[model samples]
Structures are given as C-alpha cells and as structure tokens.
Target: KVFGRCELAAAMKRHGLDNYRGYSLGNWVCAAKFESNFNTQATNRNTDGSTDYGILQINSRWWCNDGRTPGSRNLCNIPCSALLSSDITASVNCAKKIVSDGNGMNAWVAWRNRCKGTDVQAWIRGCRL
Candidate 1:
C-alpha cells in the first residue's frame, strides 16, 4: 500500500497549503481512504470536460497540462522519473498538507455527508482501504 504520497504532496505545495505535515498520519490516511479509497491509479470522469487522474484525483487536463506528455506529470508535473527518485517522506508530508487544506477535506466531508449518511468520524472508521 504505497498510497498516493507523491501526488498528494505536490498538490499541497502547488495549492499553497501550509503545516499540513504536522498533523497525524492517521488523519491523512483517513482522508485518503475517503477521497480515493487509497487507489493510486484511480481516475474519474468529471462533470466538466476533463479527467481526474491518480490518487488525489487530480484533473491533469486542467491543472496539470503537462500530463499529456510522458515523463512530464509524474508526482507533480516534475516528471515521473524524477518523482520515483525523490524523497518519500517529503512526498507524504506534502500529501498531509493537501488533505488538511480546506478544499481537500471539505470535498471529502461533502461526499461522506451525501453518500454515506453517517458522521464523518464514523465513516472514516468504517473505511476499509
């Protein structure tokens, strides 16, 4: 279970989220499970004319214009090869920031609220992934 540390972290940095890494990993893991079911290769069709790719469900066609090119959109538009060789901790830390950011958890909460019909904490505990 490598999770989506690399991509998540890049999103946090790109979005100017701060002090996200200071939170608990449990919090991050909880959010990740809720967001994409911890699926690193996850992709979804957005209502808009774009595609959300990878764990954080990033819309590569929108925010990540470079994903169309090989080796251009690895973890955070910095080339996949480069991300493979980068520090794992830094990546995870970045992911923590992203999930803790307002938009990130708000989306998670909305989904849980609308679909699960349960308290957010309860839903998080029940998530298997």
Candidate 2:
C-alpha cells in the first residue's frame, strides 16, 4: 500500500511515533517522504550489498533478517519480509527500536538530510491529527 501523506501521518501517530524520543511526528513524516514516499514495499539496495526495506527503510544489516546481508545482527528479530507488509506495525515497531538504539533519528541519513533541524510541522500541516 502506498499511503497518502495524511494517512501516513495518522498511521504513524496511531503507532505512537509522535514526539517519540523527542522527535516529532513531523520528523517521522518528513523522513518517510524522503525515505520511501509512503510506499509499503519500498526497498533500497545499499552499496555495501545490504538492503533497506519498507516505508521507513529499515536496513537488513542490523535490524531485519534477510539471510543475505553479511553478518546481519537481526537486532529487531524480524524477517525483512515483515517490513514490506501493508500492516506497518512491524515496521513501526522496528523503527522505534532503531531510534532507541542510541541513534535517535540520526539512524536515517535521509532524515538527517531532509528533516533534521527543519521546521517539519509543514509535513503534517493538514493531516488533522
């Protein structure tokens, strides 16, 4: 499922992303735009041969287990396939784990580049959340 901006905002908020770890819902919204455009099945192959999966682009290297990335830690203990589902619960949960892993939103360079320190309220401006 490819979520619209407002729906994505609502979904993330329902999953408890708002002000999670001091990062606003807008921050998550902006990162999702840059990371996957709200596409549930989005995947990006990294130069190191690992892949990122799902809307938040959780990487296979340290988070989800794809059984392909070298030395995958599977820190999230989920199959990479789970992240591609429209359900998004696993994705959201794993994303929280990523943030709580001491990286905050810094775990995603896309977030750092496009959302970090920006007034991202505009990302969720009309969402009515």
Candidate 3:
C-alpha cells in the first residue's frame, strides 16, 4: 500500500510519532517520503549485505531479522517481513525503539541527509494532524 503524504501523516500521528523522541512528526514523515516514498512493501539491499524494509526502511543490520544479515542485532525482535505490512503497528513500534536508543532519528541515513536540519513541516503540510 502506497500512502499519500497526508495519509502517512495521520498514520504516524495515530502511532504517536508526533514529537517522538524530540523529533517531530514532520521528521518521520519526511524520512519516509525519501526512504520509501510511502510504499509499505518497499525494500532495498544495502551495500553491506543487510537489507532495509518497509516505509521507513528499517535496517536488518540492527533492527529486524531477515535471517540473512551477518551478526544482526534483531533489536526490534521482529521478522523483517513484518515491517512490510500496511498496518504499520510493528513498524511504528520498532521505530520507537530505534529512536530511543540515543541515535534519535539519525539512524536513517536518508533522514539525516534529507530531513535533518531542514524545514520538515512541508512533509505534513496538508495533514490535519
């Protein structure tokens, strides 16, 4: 399921992404836009042989277990496949754990490059949340 920007905003808000870990909902939404373009099943393989999955592109290297990444942390304790679900509950919960681990939102390189220190409000412009 591909989400419109406002649609994503509402979903993230429902998951308490607003001001999560001191990062605003706009930051999360902006990162999603760049990372996966809001496609729930999006997946990308990293050069390090780990893969990224879902709308937020959580990495198998540290977050989820794809059963292929070497020495994976599986910190989220979820199969990487779960992140691809349109429901987004697992994805949101995993993301919350990720942000709480001291990296804040910088765990996503796309977020750092595109959303960090930028005016992220535009990502949620049309969303009422």
Candidate 4:
C-alpha cells in the first residue's frame, strides 16, 4: 500500500511537485491505488523478462536501458536505482514526472476503468487529485 498522507506529501515535495495543477493528493492516491495498489516494489512481468517497475510503474526497457538512466529521461537525472532506493522523495519525484507527462495518469485512468471498473475521470474529479 502507499505511504501515509504526510509521507506521501513529503515525497511529492522532494520531487518538486509541491504545486500541482489539475491534480491533487486524492487523484494521486487514487492513481496509486488503481495502478499497483500503492506498492512501491510492484512490477509487471513479460515473457522476455522486460517489466514495468516501481511506484509510477516506469517501464524498465524504456525508462532505464543502455545509456539512459532514470532522471536522464525527463525532469531530473535520477537513476532508476536511485528512484527505487528507500528514499520516498526520489521515488515520488520520479512518479511526478511520469504523471505530469500527461501520458502517465491518462494511461492509469484508462487501465483502471478497463480493469478495476472505476470511473477514473469521475474519481479524479471527485477526489480532486
């Protein structure tokens, strides 16, 4: 499960997500709840050993491969391992970028509606996350 509210907020702050537009803690919580049930170590496995890992569930091959590190891809130069470390701030920051990219939360909304029978848009609006 995801960390507590204060913990989650602190994590968000570390990732420079202190201010979010069109998003809120409730939305993030719902995304996390629907995504990996708030499990930081969650991973999606494929037959070829490729996987999407961590809280925001970044794909291993796409986000971290060859010369590309975690933070090097977008907002920050955080390595995948660095994100996976127990530092909640690092992980939250990484997740913030993924969510802010517009691709991340949108994907989650679709997936949650398909798999979890949850109206993600409604949930996001109601939760104001």
Candidate 5:
C-alpha cells in the first residue's frame, strides 16, 4: 500500500509534481486511484499482451524492459520493475517524461477513461493542498 488522497497529493507535491505537464494535481491523484488504488506494487496485464506497471501503469510495450521481452521505445530508460517500487521516484519521473513527450495524461488509459476533462476536485478533497 502507498497512500490515500491527501498523502498521495502531498507526496506528489513534495516530488514537485503538483502541476506537472500542465495537468492538474487532481488528475494525477485521480489517475493513481483508478489505475492502482495507491498500491505501489500494482501491476496489470493488458489483453493486448502488455503489462502496465505501478501507480501510473507505465506499459511494457513501449516504456520499460519486461526482462522476457525487449520493449519498442524505452523512453523512460528503466526497467518496468522499477516503477513498481514503494519509492515512487522512478514512477513519477518517468511519468513526467511521458507527459512531456506530447503524450499528455492521455498516455494513461485510466486517465483518459476516467480523469480527462472532468471535475476531479474530490480527489483532493480534505487535503486542500
């Protein structure tokens, strides 16, 4: 387990990610909630044979090494396992590279499905930071 809303937001803020890549703080929080529920070790297998890693669900198809398979474009230049760690430095940093690479938050399927262009204030409710 990692953290709930307030804690997640605080950690992201501490990591200097509150307004990263022009996305809202709530967007990051919302994406984490739906993608991994704040579980740092979360991993998901896609129907298309890709595996999504950690809170941001970075994919093995193009972002990270999956050991068994060589990824297409390792823009993040780290193993997929690195994103699954309890320390979110790799995950957050890689996510920054992702969003800044013109992928937007839309690079995350969960973000596109649930958080894009929606009011996500509830994600930061009570935290207020």
Candidate 6:
C-alpha cells in the first residue's frame, strides 16, 4: 500500500537512505514508481523466471532469498519477504549494498531509464522533508 511519493521520500530520509550510494530521494522515488509503483507487496517475475521483490524490486538472482529461486547468491542475506514488508529498512539496506556493489544505480534498469542524470528534485516536490 505504499503509495505516496513524498511520503516515501520522508520514510527514506528517516531511514538514512535519501542519499545512500548517490541515490537521491528522486532516484529511488522514480525507481519505485517504475519498478513496483511503491507497493510493498508487489512482486514481478522476470523473463528468466527470477522474481523481483518490493519497491526497489530487489532481484532474487543476487539480492535476497525467496526460497523458490535457484542460483540465488543471497548477498543481502535477507529474505524476499523482508523487502516486501512495510518497514523498508532491510529493503533499503539491500538496495544500498546493491548500488555500492554494482558501482552505481545501473543494477536497476528503472534508474537507467528514468532517474539517472535527471535533476531528480521533482520527486520530493511539496514534501515536508
């Protein structure tokens, strides 16, 4: 039910994710929109049969474990369910590690298509944060 863009930014800031790995609030906000529309319970199956979990769409290929996907590296060491929870702490941490490891936000195709190189401030527009 995670719906509001500004509200998500506030939550991200509260969790110290607003600027983690050069990912601005707008970067994630845009990614959330394209990736999962900010739905915490959202899931998507890739063409390769791997699943993406939660707002940032953490991939089962390397990020989290869903127990159903094979060849999972489980680098984040967190369950896919944690990425789907409303807490978002573990999700953000996993996303941080991903961006850090991938050397940028390019791991998320959404970022490459939407937020990368854009001004990005529009994502937090009118937010109290």
Q: Write the per-residue lDDT of candidate 1 for residues 1-129, one digit (tens) a residue.
A: 344544544443444432353433344444555556666545566554555544444444423443443333333433322222223333343344445555654434524454343343432343332
- Residue 15 alpha-carbon offset, candidate 1, angstroms: 18
- In model 6, which runs have C-alpha deviations exceeding 4 angstroms? none
For model 6, residues 66-112, the per-residue Cα lDDT tens digits are: 88888768999988899999888888889889889855889999889
lDDT of each: 0.43, 0.93, 0.93, 0.52, 0.85, 0.86
Give the clashing pairs for model 2: none
What are the RMSD figures for all models against the true structure?
8.1, 0.8, 0.9, 5.6, 1.5, 1.2
Per residue, candidate 2 scores C-alpha lDDT tens digits across 11-55 of 999999999999999999899999999999999999998999999
lDDT of 3 by residue, 1-129 (tens): 999999999999998988998888899999999999999999999999999999999999999999999988899999999999989899999999999998888889999999999999988886776
Ranking by TM-score: 2, 3, 6, 5, 4, 1
lDDT of 5 by residue, 1-129 (tens): 577779889888888788887777899999999999999889888877778999888888888888654445677899899998878889899888888877788888888999887898779888957
Clashing pairs in 6: none
Per-residue lDDT of model 4, residues 1-129, tens digit only: 455544554555455654464554455555555556666766675454555556656555445432433333333454555545455565565666566665645645424564343443343343212
lDDT of 3: 0.93
Regions more than 4 Å wrong, model 2 = none
- Best-performing candidate as measured by TM-score: 2
Q: Which ten residues in a row have the lowest lDDT in candidate 3?
A: 120-129
For model 5 the TM-score comes to 0.91
Pairwise lDDT winner, candidates 3 and 5: 3
- Pick by TM-score: 4 or 6, better one: 6
Q: 4 in model 6: Cα distance from truth in Å?
A: 0.7
Regions of model 3 farther than 4 Å from truth: none
Candidate 5 stretches with Cα past 4 Å from truth are none
- The stretch of ten residues in a row with the least summed lDDT in candidate 6 is 16-25
